[PDB]
Amino acid sequence: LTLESLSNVKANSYSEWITQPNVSRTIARELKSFLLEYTDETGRSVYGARIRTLGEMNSESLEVNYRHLAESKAILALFLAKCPEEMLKIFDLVAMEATELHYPDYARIHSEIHVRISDFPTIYSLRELRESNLSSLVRVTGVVTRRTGVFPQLKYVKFNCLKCGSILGPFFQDSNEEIRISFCTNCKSKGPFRVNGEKTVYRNYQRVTLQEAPGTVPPGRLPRHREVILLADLVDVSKPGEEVEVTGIYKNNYDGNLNAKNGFPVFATIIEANSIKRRVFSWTEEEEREFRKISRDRGIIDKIISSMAPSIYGHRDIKTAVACSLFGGVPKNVNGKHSIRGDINVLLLGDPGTAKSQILKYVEKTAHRAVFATGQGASAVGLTASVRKDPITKEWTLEGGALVLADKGVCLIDEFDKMNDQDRTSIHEAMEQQSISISKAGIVTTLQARCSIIAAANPNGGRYNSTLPLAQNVSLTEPILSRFDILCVVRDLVDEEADERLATFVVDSHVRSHPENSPIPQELLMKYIHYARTKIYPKLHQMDMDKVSRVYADLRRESISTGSFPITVRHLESILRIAESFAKMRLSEFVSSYDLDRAIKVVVDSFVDAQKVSVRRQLRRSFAIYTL
Amino acid sequence: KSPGDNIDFQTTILSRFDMIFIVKDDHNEERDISIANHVINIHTGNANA
Ligand SMILES: Nc1ncnc2c1ncn2[C@@H]1O[C@H](COP(=O)(O)OP(=O)(O)OP(O)(O)=S)[C@@H](O)[C@H]1O
Ligand SMILES: [Mg+2]
Ligand SMILES: [Zn+2]
């Protein structure tokens, strides 16, 4: 048969037309010709290169573009659009033969090649799927809500007979319905056959609920949701919370006795996914050379300071604290007996309208393992470890909380002041021991919580009062206040020029965002931070001990004389940790003197600005040599 | 202030303990130089050796 003969149909439906052996073999031959002979008039065969790439990568997925097939054989594209299941089976066999043309031993490795159709033209929302789309290919966008675990579904089903013990041949399991055998072919009996799992082959299975993206829903309408079944290679591809686009066959899920509550013969619908498309902190060989090139600049650190939160303007010391917390120091354990913490905890205490929450959102976007939590809010991950039983699943699960979940990362606690008692205790343990101990529901254990904390708080009464010291402006007690390395107090004092530039920045941000209308790039910066966190590990050498010990006594005696809350050893440790964090931005294996001076500047500025104004006036003049 | 005036609890718990230790900040240069050098050797790695 020919393509023009394929255009004419003789059977009652399209599916019965494709079911005929002659039409099936004609479609197989035409798909073979399309797969082996398609070129983009540039002298290269894109599909041959794709087959070679999937063979050398040992993958069972072949991406076939729909517009290529539409330009090549439009009638086969229409057949795929109307009846995708059996034509996809045909093209599975065709692609398998095309792969065996190059690699003759690929059948024993996989024996299954999945064809993924990309760039389907018709775009449907989940709220406009109707009667006409059943057993047809639909391309729908949406946000994944939650996903199930990967389950083994039977693929090549093998039985054994209870009468004789003979093991029967493998049979293909159709995804639509369960398969069953009634004959033994050895003892010639219709006896009870049982499926043995050791000789049965399985495919992976996942069940993913997709809703309409909330941006695109009409006003009074709720976002519609469908359920998508991911097969063997597509499992664990789309994490919940991200906007994804799935091409697949829209079909009915069959259930026993329909629905008794409705009283109408009503079926539920599923989408068997054909392809998943997403609408990464991996550095290549060129990326590390680029990182070394950008590190050798003298003013690299300031650029990172200028790269923190571009939508936030003027809070340079806050951005410096963000950069120090994002890069972090090195933890250490001398002889196993004594442990020194190696990550910077930053407390942003500020009046309303100082854009602390936007800084927290920026860090959540930038950091590798960033966990957002809040004290007053409800729909967020908690700060306390718990053992929780699902009311429906009846399954006990151990939740480590946001502190354990932010291990080797950063935890961002918005509204640090109106926290409750259990969350305060969780934070206290997570900063003291860097671990969380649980004794609940028969589970007695400890979970590592080596997490940096960037917290945001509002002062008591809605304003910072500079006449009172820091402890009287915040509901936080002394031990939890002492655990922070950088203590950024930001206040919106009235300055005319600052107000003018801030208002200009905000109004310009609005006028750029209208629908009718030297910083490092973010993508480079995120991988740079990950690289410096994961491979640098700076170290400080012995001949710089004569200056840090000098400046430590210089601050301690002045703190005694002035009468503020004392400088302890932990301020020296904060100096030495912030120094190791600043040295990471240079990708440096050692700690330099300007590095230490900058860390001392950060710690001195953080200690001074948290004081009574009487303390501020003396401490600014006494520590003028270190602030510079 | 009295030792029982600085505690945020009753004075009976103090009698309840076996040995009490009132730990001081001595607040002088000759001690905090030594403490600073000790902590710097801890961070350096000399103290491990
Ligand atoms: N320095 C700034 N630069 C840019 N935008 C700012 C600045 N200060 C405030 N804003 C804006 O003002 C608004 C304040 O939002 P938030 O970040 O929620 O404030 P906040 O600091 O978290 O104070 P709260 O909500 O009382 S804890 C946002 O629209 C910010 O974009
Ligand atoms: Mg806020
Ligand atoms: Zn038998």
XYZ file of C-alpha atoms in Angstrom, chain A residues 9-304:
296
model
C -10.122 4.495 5.009
C -12.270 1.375 4.656
C -13.013 0.288 8.235
C -15.772 1.775 10.385
C -13.348 3.584 12.715
C -9.725 4.686 12.555
C -8.674 2.115 15.165
C -10.149 -0.765 13.162
C -8.372 0.630 10.089
C -4.986 0.572 11.831
C -5.753 -2.855 13.352
C -5.678 -4.485 9.893
C -2.366 -6.296 9.201
C -1.832 -4.691 5.785
C -2.375 -1.148 7.075
C -0.157 -1.931 10.073
C 2.714 -3.232 7.936
C 2.349 -0.294 5.530
C 2.516 2.156 8.450
C 5.527 0.276 9.841
C 7.342 0.526 6.493
C 6.505 4.225 6.137
C 7.678 4.936 9.690
C 10.894 3.045 8.929
C 11.429 5.185 5.824
C 10.693 8.359 7.805
C 13.057 7.382 10.626
C 15.885 6.339 8.297
C 15.582 9.033 5.615
C 14.511 12.279 7.310
C 16.937 15.161 6.821
C 16.541 18.891 7.429
C 18.088 19.751 4.007
C 21.425 20.433 5.742
C 23.041 17.059 5.032
C 22.540 15.635 8.534
C 20.094 12.967 9.696
C 18.836 14.155 13.080
C 17.064 10.878 13.875
C 20.109 8.741 13.083
C 22.147 10.931 15.425
C 19.410 10.573 18.054
C 19.468 6.768 17.730
C 23.269 6.775 18.032
C 23.098 9.036 21.101
C 20.469 6.906 22.846
C 22.450 3.766 22.040
C 25.697 5.177 23.417
C 23.915 6.569 26.496
C 22.049 3.264 27.129
C 18.624 4.910 27.175
C 15.221 3.588 26.119
C 13.819 7.030 25.212
C 13.724 8.375 21.650
C 12.498 11.940 21.133
C 10.594 12.262 17.846
C 9.399 15.724 16.859
C 5.798 15.988 15.699
C 6.417 18.761 13.162
C 9.053 16.615 11.431
C 6.529 13.804 10.955
C 3.873 16.336 9.917
C 6.144 17.744 7.204
C 7.233 14.250 6.147
C 3.982 12.226 6.296
C 0.968 14.326 7.285
C -1.474 11.397 7.241
C 0.635 9.471 9.766
C 0.763 12.570 11.975
C -3.040 12.743 11.792
C -3.243 9.022 12.623
C -0.992 9.589 15.646
C -3.150 12.522 16.756
C -6.378 10.522 16.464
C -5.362 7.006 17.606
C -2.038 7.257 19.466
C -1.905 3.922 21.322
C -1.515 1.277 18.620
C 0.391 3.605 16.294
C 2.818 4.268 19.149
C 3.127 0.487 19.535
C 3.907 0.238 15.810
C 6.500 3.004 16.041
C 7.946 1.306 19.138
C 8.593 -1.761 16.980
C 9.920 0.419 14.132
C 12.314 2.331 16.398
C 13.453 -0.951 17.954
C 14.292 -2.314 14.497
C 16.056 0.949 13.605
C 18.139 0.644 16.779
C 18.944 -3.001 15.990
C 20.115 -1.878 12.539
C 23.016 -0.072 14.233
C 23.511 -2.023 17.474
C 22.677 -5.737 17.045
C 23.074 -6.554 20.764
C 20.733 -3.832 22.062
C 17.763 -6.229 22.243
C 19.198 -8.283 25.108
C 19.999 -5.135 27.112
C 16.598 -3.417 26.911
C 14.097 -5.178 24.569
C 11.933 -2.027 24.775
C 12.311 1.426 23.200
C 9.893 4.195 24.154
C 9.126 6.872 21.564
C 8.422 10.323 23.018
C 6.535 12.748 20.783
C 7.619 16.368 21.238
C 6.179 19.704 20.054
C 2.587 18.582 19.617
C 0.814 21.661 18.197
C -2.575 21.575 19.934
C -2.464 23.028 23.447
C -5.221 22.224 25.935
C -5.832 23.384 29.469
C -7.096 20.897 32.029
C -10.404 22.796 32.211
C -11.204 22.244 28.509
C -10.753 18.477 28.184
C -14.010 17.068 26.823
C -15.727 14.078 25.195
C -13.844 14.503 21.903
C -10.388 13.976 23.425
C -10.870 10.401 24.652
C -8.348 7.909 23.225
C -6.467 10.811 21.637
C -3.192 12.664 22.111
C -3.455 15.825 24.218
C -0.757 18.262 25.338
C -1.677 19.834 28.674
C 0.218 22.184 30.977
C -0.048 22.414 34.731
C 1.522 22.319 38.173
C 2.276 18.985 39.848
C 0.620 18.835 43.271
C 1.897 15.539 44.668
C 3.285 12.276 43.328
C 3.188 8.665 44.457
C 6.109 6.324 44.936
C 7.501 4.175 42.152
C 5.613 0.873 41.998
C 6.405 -2.273 39.975
C 3.734 -2.963 37.353
C 3.721 -6.324 35.574
C 5.110 -6.135 32.016
C 6.101 -9.674 30.916
C 3.817 -11.823 33.044
C 4.912 -15.392 33.793
C 2.773 -18.035 35.510
C 3.104 -21.423 37.143
C 0.542 -24.223 37.323
C -0.363 -25.671 40.715
C -1.152 -29.106 39.250
C 2.258 -29.825 37.693
C 4.598 -26.998 38.731
C 5.452 -26.098 35.135
C 6.435 -22.484 34.492
C 4.624 -20.968 31.519
C 5.893 -18.560 28.891
C 6.088 -14.788 29.264
C 3.071 -12.746 28.172
C 2.857 -9.002 27.590
C 0.700 -7.129 30.106
C -1.456 -4.503 28.436
C -1.572 -1.328 30.507
C -5.342 -1.055 29.979
C -6.468 -4.282 31.687
C -5.231 -7.298 33.623
C -4.271 -10.369 31.584
C -5.161 -13.943 32.532
C -4.383 -17.416 31.174
C -6.805 -20.358 31.147
C -4.636 -23.189 29.744
C -1.408 -24.872 30.847
C -0.185 -26.413 27.525
C 1.795 -29.012 29.524
C -0.734 -30.967 31.607
C -3.703 -29.600 29.579
C -5.594 -28.230 32.576
C -7.578 -25.092 33.379
C -6.372 -25.213 36.972
C -5.392 -22.289 39.197
C -2.286 -20.597 37.811
C -0.269 -18.258 40.026
C 2.014 -15.363 39.115
C 5.570 -15.825 40.385
C 7.361 -12.534 40.920
C 10.907 -13.841 40.558
C 10.479 -14.721 36.868
C 8.033 -11.893 36.092
C 9.430 -8.695 34.556
C 8.136 -5.301 35.694
C 8.047 -1.686 34.552
C 8.121 1.369 36.789
C 4.841 3.110 37.611
C 4.060 6.517 39.086
C 0.828 8.423 39.681
C 1.036 12.226 39.565
C -1.776 14.705 40.185
C -1.675 17.771 37.934
C -3.718 20.919 38.472
C -4.210 23.915 36.235
C -1.593 26.575 36.928
C -3.225 29.224 39.167
C -2.081 32.080 36.934
C -4.157 30.853 33.993
C -7.456 29.987 35.730
C -10.510 32.165 34.949
C -11.619 34.290 37.944
C -14.519 32.503 39.620
C -13.430 29.015 38.635
C -11.476 26.520 40.685
C -8.375 24.955 39.090
C -9.293 21.641 37.499
C -7.079 18.643 38.161
C -6.322 15.461 36.259
C -4.242 12.422 37.118
C -1.217 11.392 35.037
C 0.389 7.943 34.925
C 4.150 7.930 34.337
C 5.639 4.752 32.863
C 9.043 3.128 33.299
C 11.448 5.829 32.118
C 9.354 8.885 33.058
C 9.257 8.133 36.799
C 10.664 10.701 39.262
C 11.091 13.324 36.531
C 8.815 16.160 37.682
C 8.955 17.176 41.326
C 5.796 18.731 42.798
C 5.562 22.497 42.857
C 6.864 23.108 39.327
C 5.057 23.932 36.092
C 5.379 21.047 33.641
C 3.814 20.141 30.293
C 2.711 16.571 29.569
C 1.809 15.036 26.218
C -0.199 11.853 26.505
C -3.237 9.778 25.647
C -6.459 10.930 27.316
C -8.440 7.822 28.265
C -10.917 6.460 30.800
C -10.044 4.650 34.010
C -12.268 1.577 34.323
C -13.764 0.871 37.751
C -16.061 -1.817 39.106
C -19.810 -1.047 39.170
C -19.115 2.627 38.199
C -20.085 5.163 40.923
C -23.055 4.426 43.177
C -23.156 7.944 44.656
C -23.800 9.700 41.336
C -26.461 7.332 40.010
C -25.210 8.003 36.459
C -22.849 5.893 34.309
C -19.918 8.232 34.866
C -16.265 7.306 34.316
C -13.062 8.859 35.619
C -10.286 9.993 33.293
C -6.507 9.564 33.286
C -3.651 10.748 31.085
C -1.042 8.114 30.235
C 2.026 10.303 29.765
C 3.876 10.021 26.470
C 6.328 12.835 27.211
C 7.198 15.199 30.064
C 8.708 18.642 29.447
C 9.798 21.108 32.124
C 8.770 24.673 31.295
C 21.011 22.674 38.107
C 24.244 23.079 40.082
C 26.429 21.128 37.658
C 29.733 22.662 36.567
C 31.435 21.414 33.410
C 35.128 21.526 32.543
C 34.690 25.031 31.111
C 32.641 26.155 34.122
C 35.431 25.519 36.638
C 37.908 27.395 34.433
C 35.442 30.294 34.275
C 35.135 30.158 38.078
C 38.924 30.324 38.436
C 39.020 33.204 35.941
C 36.400 35.202 37.844
C 38.023 34.427 41.214
C 41.402 35.921 40.251
C 39.827 39.382 39.991
C 40.834 41.558 42.929
C 37.368 42.992 43.547
C 35.489 39.713 43.181
C 33.977 39.772 46.691
C 32.330 43.173 46.224
C 30.779 41.926 42.981
C 29.236 39.057 44.943
